[PDB]
Symmetry: C3
Subunit: 127 residues, 3 copies
């Protein structure tokens, strides 16, 4: 999985190092990926480049996860739940200020180490 | 829906605040979302980070919309047409210079307010 | 096809102009798109905004290609392999340091030059 995190620069920049650890722990625990396979991109946004509802706070976080298609509905829902729980518990950011979107990609639409994703023999199960 | 907008910094930055207002009106009117649900991210690009063909002017605008799966084809085409119309009318940007891409995501692949999107009310 | 490229700023900025030429050539040759249709966006990242595994280098390069659905599996796989080969050959970036992801979008989900993409008469064949 690839993660892309968007947030207000003044709020995201102080926490992004620990947020990276937290999010990676969630994908290890729920998706059973190798602890080594952390691919994260952070986009701290200027105030004028980020609009969110006036009843949310500036802690508002958008998390996009690009991942191999094929996981069960239950595993995916468990992932969303685990990220909500761990970010809230670690930073006190309310679940109302967190949004998560899973982008599923067929294995054959993904290139890794020079070959299409469906020709990889992975060390874990995509179910 | 979540919107991501891309354009040359010196063209997008003077207009992005008004453009946010226009795009939110369009999503409200066509998709019938509640008027508080504005989620927009803007990406003003340096000229060295943005390549587009010579038949597009420096007004070229890319508008990505990430939304729940489930709208009809007619609703979605009306959204594109409404965005094309309203952005052209408000800013004088030719429709030739506007690109819109809809990323539909199954409801169960979204986490909102702590729960999966297929379980919201 | 729309291309988005992500890499560390000090590594991506010296190569992005030639890389753009390399990527466009690959899409022309494999997808047979009209050679004027280059749409590329570059995202040079700060060191603190870019996490990748310890068995990758800071040449690590992410390539996202958003394209009309409808190409064959073999054509898409040929696109992946061609980009890997030509990027490796031109810049000496090992193919483990390159990752490619195709985002396929139905034609009616795209607005181009004022109309939905399923109503466009194209100058090439999508498939």
């Amino acid at each position: 999985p690839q993660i892309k995190v968007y947030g207000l620069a003044e709020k995201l920049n102080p926490i992004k190092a620990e947020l990276s650890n937290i999010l990676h722990t969630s994908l290890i625990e729920v998706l059973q990926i190798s602890p080594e396979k952390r691919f994260h991109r952070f986009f701290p946004l200027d105030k004028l480049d980020f609009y969110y509802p006036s009843d949310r706070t500036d802690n508002y976080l958008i998390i996009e996860i690009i991942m191999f298609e094929g996981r069960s509905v239950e595993t995916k829902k468990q992932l969303l739940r685990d990220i909500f729980k761990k970010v809230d518990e670690k930073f006190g950011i309310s679940v109302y200020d967190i949004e998560i979107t899973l982008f599923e990609i067929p294995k054959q639409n993904w290139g890794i180490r020079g070959i299409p994703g469906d020709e990889l023999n992975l060390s874990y199960k995509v179910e």
